[PDB]
């Protein structure tokens with residue numbers, strides 16, 4: 630498996646490893662529940678260096694990104710980031726990501742681990758008519774997510790500039806524990822928090838410095854297990870599970886990141902699509918302690934209406950929760966059925982999204 634520059638720290642911390650997207654990563658250190666609670670109560674530090682970072686440099690950096698992503702990057706001002714999706718010619722979703730508008734001549738794209746290759750190949754094969762140079766800097770870049778309601782007050786004493794001045798989905802180059810670091814007020818938890826992008830070689834010392842602070846305010850380093858529970862609770866999508874090239878943004882509740890008034894790949898296909906939105910992604914709350922897995926059929930009074938995309942147990946709500954891609958006719962309040970292995974039916978209630986929202990801003 631692949632190992633991030635923090636692998637050794639995770640091993641010395643006694644974490645249980647799991648194979649995620651080809652990477653040897655920590656599922657949890659102590660326990661998934663405990664780590665989710667650190668995120669929900671104080672702060673949870675995540676090693677997310679398995680994700681990829683692409684660099685776009687050149688006079689037409691803005692318009693290139695604007696051509697590739699569904700969201701409006703052309704209007705973003707320096708130091709602003711934007712969550713978006715990338716579609717193919719048919720409106721299918723290649724990946725979801727975050728792009729940073731450093732300046733008119735430079736942007737940073739951060740994508741999902743399992744899609745680094747596919748994304749980079751797709752991005753590079755579309756640079757031809759743009760005055761830009763695209764490069765993958767993943768191999769030497771690390772990324773750390775410091776999430777939690779106490780994240781800011783805790784991280785601050787190691788950062789040279791005022792964190793308070795960084796607005797939600799905004800970033801700024803700064804020094805953290807003595808090293809050049811891009812600090813953005815972003816996250817995948819639904820709580821307030823930050824993401825620290827830095828040179829892989831400096832990851833160990835930044836992580837060690839931060840760990841010293843965590844023990845002091847009762848925080849915890851957190852694994853992918855907690856990362857998955859927190860994002861599902863926050864109701865953020867997971868590419869490959871809740872969406873893929875066989876779903877368009879409209880079917881998975883991401884219409885808001887699609888601006889049809891500008892030009893981009895998949896635009897024409899999306900115009901037609903939005904006129905016929907037949908599927909939707911709904912939030913379910915199941916009876917029992919069993920966890921639904923992707924692919925389980927979802928029924929309504931005996932008739933199939935879709936399938937599970939993501940499942941997990943929410944300690945915050947104390948319920949088995951899940952996301953499901955179902956027919957347009959499914960409504961909030963419906964009593965559905967999830968078929969578990971062996972035809973075992975499990976009741977589920979369609980509830981309003983998102984399941985939970987913490988201290989995350991804006």
Ligand SMILES: Nc1nc2c(c(=O)[nH]1)N[C@@H](CNc1ccc(C(=O)N[C@@H](CCC(=O)O)C(=O)O)cc1)CN2
Nearest residue numbers: 712725726727739740741798815816817824865866
């Ligand atoms: N760097 C960064 N980049 C990433 C991820 C990350 O983990 N951090 N993970 C993948 C993308 N997944 C998401 C999904 C949702 C959000 C998110 O934050 N959503 C808010 C956005 C609000 C807004 O833009 O105003 C919401 O309410 O829907 C962030 C990353 C790929 N790139």
